A paper describes a structure:
The second structure of the oxidoreductase reported here was solved at 2.2 Å resolution and refined to an overall R-factor of 21.1%. The asymmetric unit also contained a dimer, and the α-carbons for the two subunits superimpose with a root-mean-square deviation of 0.4 Å. Whereas the enzyme was crystallized in the presence of CDP-6-d-glucitol and NADP(H), no electron density was observed for the dinucleotide. The electron density was unambiguous for the CDP-6-d-glucitol ligands in both subunits, however, as can be seen in Figure 8a for the ligand bound to Subunit B. The α-carbons for Subunit B with either bound CDP or CDP-6-d-glucitol correspond with a root-mean-square deviation of 0.5 Å. The glucitol C1′ hydroxyl lies within 3.2 Å of the guanidinium group of Arg 208. The C2′ hydroxyl hydrogen bonds with the backbone carbonyl oxygen of Thr 195. The C3′ and C4′ hydroxyls are bridged by Nε2 of Gln 196, and the C5′ hydroxyl hydrogen bonds to the side chain of Glu 140. Although the NADP(H) ligand was not bound, it is possible to approximate the position of the dinucleotide by superimposing the two structures presented here. This superposition suggests that the C2′ carbon of the substrate is within 3 Å of C4 of the nicotinamide ring of the cofactor and lies on the si face. In addition, the model of the enzyme with bound CDP-6-d-glucitol represents the first molecular view of the manner in which an enzyme in this superfamily can accommodate an open-chain nucleotide-linked sugar in its active site pocket.
Here, we describe the biochemical analysis of these two proteins and show that the enzyme encoded by HS5.18 catalyzes the formation of cytidine diphosphate (CDP)-6-d-fructose from cytidine triphosphate (CTP) and d-fructose-6-phosphate, and the enzyme encoded by HS5.17 reduces CDP-6-d-fructose with NADPH to generate CDP-6-d-glucitol. The overall fold of this enzyme places it into the well-characterized short-chain dehydrogenase/reductase (SDR) superfamily of enzymes. Unique to this protein is an extended α-helix that precedes the beginning of the Rossmann fold that is found in all SDR proteins. The individual subunits adopt a bilobal-type architecture with the N-terminal domain composed of Met 1 to Thr 201 and the C-terminal domain formed by Ala 202 to Glu 332.
Residue numbers in the entry:
A (entry chain A): 1 to 334
B (entry chain B): -7 to 334
The structure:
């Protein structure tokens, strides 16, 4: 646990400590600081910068932060955006609902939360004279655009009658706002679009596919696929997402959109079940007669990631170490 | 005054309301006595709807400024006693039966000069009217939407299942994106809380009671003719769309109000009025005896790129609706009405 994390932290600081210290003593606010990516950014940066962490619930941000070996006292945790009086130089907006079920069960809320939080955070930044804001977005913004070498100018098309579009539509409008604040008020903004993050400190209560697999293998000595498992995507280790964001934080550029993916990790859902079954000594069963309306249709997509590689970033964590480090940290917690 | 003992309401508006009763009073009447909230009731379309329905029906209006709603509703010779204006939803106490959500920005310049407010006004207004329609236990909500939602989808015969795609770095997409996210919320509310909703996508309304401050191209062409003895085209004017009389928009909406259907989308267009911007400019130049000139040197960033497009309007027609007002009557009545104001 301390093993896994400490290694990585030293790996990051070995390879990139140059860049990480272009934000020494920068005043940095992270929204959703309690979530998967939020935490690890907080973890990586709080020694080397003043960190403000905006979260839904301070107490569990405290539990979570010292589970991942953090220094409670080197971060200021707010629950209310308007109590943050200090001047922020960099905002990293990471807050959003993450579960597939919530997107189809509460599509209105999904939109309202994401839309309102984006609006508020943009107000805040422009009023607080922020130097840069980074907005986490999603590969789901590409919609019907399938296949390889998808570039940040490709544009998805979205039906207003498909409930599950709650999530992309919400991130789409947020992006549009983000770019519009940049062009109206010459405020530097970046949008970063993730595939799906994996790796240590993922929680067993997550229902995104990687953890549905790990958790089914452990708790039911079985992994069940509700589809044929032909969806093919790239994955990335959460620390590789953090580092990518850091490289983007250091860039002077009034506006840019960056895909974030590890292109070496391209694999199908089925192939992902198999690897995880092998690592956890379990078998893979199908069951294709359940309701799957929270899920996306079958597709394949690779993201052109030329921009983050041009900044000098590289991914440190292949699929194996990411899975192993993820699995190990779930065992070691329960 | 009333020297011929026939009342004093505007002649153009009188005639239009009478054709409207003769042709479609069956449906207009089916809405009688029904409690009806109209948002943006001060605007071009909401006000004509209010004027049409506030005879027979009890009618609640929602507006930014009750002031200019009173002034609007009497420019168009409404009866202020028979409507109940409000600036805030949380007042409205009585059981609303039907909601017609018409409020929205309307001006191209505002979409590029205020893209964030364009989004935020439409989103918030939509969300609010939806919360309210769920609280109050409304029969049906009708959301007014735009052909701009078709975005890049161009050409003839565009259906309601088609949809556009929008770049997040084109500022001018404020409007369509706001309407898209709103359409989506309207559908999501229907599917999730069995709230009967209808979406009506409009081309561009014209006809009498168009106010002279409006900068959409029809009035750009009319206020230009009159205030400067000249009609100026800032593009080659090849854009080709369908237009519709504002009264014809209103009847279309009333027809949809009489439908009992959980969720439906309707394109609202008069396909008999399919004209280029250039030909629109010509016909308006002929009726005011002014000339048409090109100025291609201005910033046109608030304007959509040049396209040609027809909406498929079969569904509205299959209900029994027809447009009563061809291009000639709509322009003529629209010019005459502006002249009586100044
Ligand atoms: N028990 C299973 C589980 C899964 N599958 C298959 O895996 C696919 C992928 O599963 P999911 O990723 O969990 O669900 P989804 O399709 O909704 O995509 C969500 C994804 O875009 C987001 O999670 C973002 O990556 C994230 O960054 C947001 O914060 C499913 O669509 C289904 O085909 C399955 O067959 N049997
Ligand atoms: N002085 C002129 C004026 C115009 N034109 C041309 O006419 C086109 C049409 O002008 P506009 O309609 O005013 O501008 P826009 O393209 O922004 O379309 C707005 C329209 O989609 C909405 O107004 C909806 O119809 C309405 O329902 C929203 O409430 C311009 O894009 C331009 O090519 C011109 O050449 N010279
Ligand atoms: Cl959080
Ligand atoms: Cl704005
Ligand atoms: Na139709």
């Amino acid at each position: 646990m301390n093993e896994i994390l400490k290694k990585r932290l030293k790996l990051l600081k070995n390879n990139f400590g140059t860049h990480i210290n272009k934000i020494a003593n920068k005043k940095i606010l992270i929204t959703g600081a309690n979530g998967y990516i939020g935490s690890i950014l907080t973890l990586i940066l709080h020694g080397n910068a003043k960190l403000y962490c905006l979260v839904r619930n301070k107490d569990k941000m405290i539990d979570r932060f010292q589970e991942i070996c953090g220094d409670i006292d080197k971060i200021d945790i707010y629950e209310d955006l308007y109590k943050i009086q200090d001047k922020i130089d960099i905002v990293i907006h990471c807050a959003a609902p993450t579960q597939s079920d919530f997107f189809i069960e509460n599509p209105i809320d999904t939109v309202d939360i994401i839309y309102t939080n984006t609006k508020n955070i943009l107000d805040f930044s422009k009023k607080n004279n922020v130097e840069k804001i980074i907005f986490l977005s999603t590969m789901e913004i590409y919609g019907d655009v399938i296949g390889d070498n998808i570039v940040e100018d490709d544009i998805g098309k979205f039906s207003v009658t498909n409930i599950r579009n709650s999530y992309p539509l919400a991130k789409q409008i947020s992006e549009f706002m983000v770019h519009s604040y940049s062009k109206k008020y010459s405020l530097s903004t970046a949008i970063v679009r993730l595939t799906q993050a994996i790796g240590p400190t993922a929680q067993i209560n997550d229902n995104r596919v990687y953890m549905d697999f790990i958790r089914s293998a452990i708790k039911k000595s079985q992994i069940t696929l509700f589809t044929k498992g032909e969806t093919k995507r790239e994955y990335i280790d959460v620390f590789d997402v953090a580092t990518a964001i850091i490289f983007v934080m250091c860039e002077k550029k009034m506006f840019e959109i960056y895909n974030i993916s590890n292109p070496n990790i391209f694999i199908s859902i089925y192939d992902l079940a198999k690897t995880i079954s092998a690592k956890l000594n379990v078998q893979v069963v199908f069951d294709l007669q359940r309701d799957t309306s929270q899920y996306l249709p079958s597709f394949s997509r690779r993201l052109n990631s030329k921009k983050i590689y041009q900044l000098g970033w590289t991914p440190l964590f292949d699929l194996n170490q990411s899975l192993d480090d993820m699995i190990k940290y779930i065992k070691e917690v329960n």
